[PDB]
Amino acid sequence: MQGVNIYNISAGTSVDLAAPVTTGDIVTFFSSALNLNAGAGNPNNTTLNLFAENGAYLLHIAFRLQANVIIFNSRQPDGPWLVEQRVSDVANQFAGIDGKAMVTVFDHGDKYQVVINEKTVIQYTKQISGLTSSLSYNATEETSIFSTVVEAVTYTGLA
Amino acid sequence: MQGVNIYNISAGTSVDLAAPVTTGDIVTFFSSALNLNAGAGNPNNTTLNLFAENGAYLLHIAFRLQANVIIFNSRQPDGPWLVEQRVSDVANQFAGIDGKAMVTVFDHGDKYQVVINEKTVIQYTKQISGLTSSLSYNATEETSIFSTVVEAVTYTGLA
Numbered sequence: 545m546q547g548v549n550i551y552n553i554s555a556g557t558s559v560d561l562a563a564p565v566t567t568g569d570i571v572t573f574f575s576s577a578l579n580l581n582a583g584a585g586n587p588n589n590t591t592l593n594l595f596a597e598n599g600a601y602l603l604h605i606a607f608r609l610q611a612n613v614i615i616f617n618s619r620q621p622d623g624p625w626l627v628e629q630r631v632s633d634v635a636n637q638f639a640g641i642d643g644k645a646m647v648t649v650f651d652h653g654d655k656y657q658v659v660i661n662e663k664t665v666i667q668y669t670k671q672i673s674g675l676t677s678s679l680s681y682n683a684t685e686e687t688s689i690f691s692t693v694v695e696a697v698t699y700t701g702l703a
Numbered sequence: 704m705q706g707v708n709i710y711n712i713s714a715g716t717s718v719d720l721a722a723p724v725t726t727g728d729i730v731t732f733f734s735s736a737l738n739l740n741a742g743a744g745n746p747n748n749t750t751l752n753l754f755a756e757n758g759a760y761l762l763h764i765a766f767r768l769q770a771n772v773i774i775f776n777s778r779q780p781d782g783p784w785l786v787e788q789r790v791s792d793v794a795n796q797f798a799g800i801d802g803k804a805m806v807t808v809f810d811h812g813d814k815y816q817v818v819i820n821e822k823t824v825i826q827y828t829k830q831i832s833g834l835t836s837s838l839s840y841n842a843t844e845e846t847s848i849f850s851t852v853v854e855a856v857t858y859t860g861l862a
């Protein structure tokens with residue numbers, strides 16, 4: 545049966561999913577703020593991650609204000625960062641909506657479709673495969689482009 | 704061709720969907736407040752609706768604090784309200800989450816699965832079929848159990 549799960553992630557923390565995200569499933573991160581004027585990242589201002597049970601970074605989404613870019617990557621638990629995919633113009637992706645933001649990830653099996661608010665920003669071909677069993681939102685209060693608390697909603701059992 | 708559409712509905716208004724909601728699709732209403740101490744409804748404190756192209760209420764979700772019940776019903780544009788399905792203990796459905804809430808609707812074709820937060824409250828057998836062309840959130844800035852503006856998110860092209 546289709547299901548909805550809600551998690552509240554504090555900047556810099558992770559949450560274990562009660563229902564893993566697999567092929568055909570959906571995950572959306574919700575921010576109750578949009579701070580496109582925050583200081584520079586070191587180098588990241590904000591990141592959202594989809595973890596496998598073994599700790600692999602299935603999907604790493606990093607937002608860099610000063611570099612004006614959004615990075616999409618993956619990584620094994622004890623391996624090096626893999627091939628980065630970049631998308632310039634950070635502010636442009638959040639256009640049309642101020643004060644809050646949304647990042648959605650459709651798990652399509654061979655790829656992760658990433659949507660910023662209503663705009664699909666990338667069709668990310670997976671570098672690592674696996675069920676998403678954990679999620680994290682990493683940032684500080686000072687330089688995150690999102691609210692200190694980011695709400696994550698998963699839609700599972702869809703296929 | 705999955706897609707995400709975002710709408711911000713002010714209490715008492717309707718919004719037209721850019722991408723219709725049909726079998727296999729999902730729509731979630733997000734409230735940035737939870738007012739279980741609001742004045743009595745008249746009889747509704749808050750209603751969320753899915754409308755067909757012809758104005759028919761495909762799904763009418765009515766929250767009644769005083770009556771301590773949630774109504775699920777349908778009706779043709781110029782027809783009478785049909786057979787109500789009801790669920791008691793309103794506050795109980797929102798248990799565990801204070802200050803906000805969400806109501807998700809899964810269009811399963813023959814039924815609408817309504818989920819408040821993570822809790823499935825009803826498997827509503829459709830009284831009227833068709834694609835959802837519009838949505839609405841009806842209430843007053845004084846007795847709604849939700850925030851004045853409710854955000855509606857649709858995930859379409861999932862089937």
Ligand SMILES: CC(=O)N[C@H]1[C@@H](Oc2ccc([N+](=O)[O-])cc2)O[C@H](CO)[C@H](O)[C@@H]1O[C@@H]1O[C@H](CO)[C@H](O)[C@H](O)[C@H]1O
Nearest residue numbers: 586587588591604605606615616617618625626627628
């Ligand atoms: C500080 C900074 O901008 N780091 C970038 C930079 O890091 C490197 C690393 C190695 C070399 N090199 O051997 O020539 C050059 C630059 O570029 C990297 C990509 O080439 C990364 O963008 C790195 O930042 C790291 O990115 C990963 C994701 O790929 C992750 O976000 C890390 O937290 C981040 O430090």
Ligand SMILES: CC(=O)N[C@H]1[C@@H](Oc2ccc([N+](=O)[O-])cc2)O[C@H](CO)[C@H](O)[C@@H]1O[C@@H]1O[C@H](CO)[C@H](O)[C@H](O)[C@H]1O
Nearest residue numbers: 745746747750763764765774775776777784785786787
């Ligand atoms: C004020 C109130 O509690 N209205 C209820 C009530 O209305 C009726 C109507 C007819 C009869 N009757 O012929 O014996 C009794 C009560 O009960 C109705 C269901 O029987 C409705 O619940 C009505 O509220 C209306 O419900 C519809 C959805 O079904 C919609 O929410 C309307 O806005 C609401 O007024």
